[PDB]
Symmetry: D2
Subunit: 59 residues, 4 copies
């Protein structure tokens, strides 16, 4: 039966609300993951430039 009772209809709206909230949650968890990754990136790059400099100073 395609028709929803009032209770089914309110629960469906709730669930949609919840799904959209979870999407936003997961988008921020993704932003947090990239913050981590970028911090790693920056620190690797500082270590890389330091070692290039080391090698070239011992040229």
């Amino acid at each position: 039966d395609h028709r929803l009772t009032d209770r089914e209809w309110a629960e469906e709206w709730k669930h949609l609300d919840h799904l959209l909230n979870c999407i936003m949650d997961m988008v921020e968890k993704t932003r947090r993951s990239l913050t981590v990754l970028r911090r790693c990136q920056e620190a690797d790059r500082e270590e890389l430039n330091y070692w290039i400099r080391r090698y070239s100073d011992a040229e």
Copy 2:
């Protein structure tokens, strides 16, 4: 320490992969919710037009 071991770095990429997959999952669960809602909408509208017609036939 901002730098990730190789294992931490592979796990971070994994987790990002997983987060993005979950977002896509939840977007499709949302599409499914709206399919439900629209089917309810259409069936309510058919019932509404039927009852308007009923009332007007008993005018």
Copy 3:
């Protein structure tokens, strides 16, 4: 030499950040379109209950 400058890396992560921002915006835009559609759906639902009752009072 195929590896990025500091500025190129900074652009990359900013571009990622922008994409996530576009996703959030698109979701909160969905959330707001849905507030209005629930309202429209409810008007139809309750209008159905209305005609049904007027029909019953009239017998």
Copy 4:
């Protein structure tokens, strides 16, 4: 009379569907930007290990 026609309702749900489609597209676009950035990050990581080893061979 403030309730929507059949066509207006059909537009509404199609507009929702489009927004979800835009979200999916934005996510799979993130997924593809990330494949390239992992590659760039890895080039830097391994280039670091490289200079470290050449430095050690040279003492």
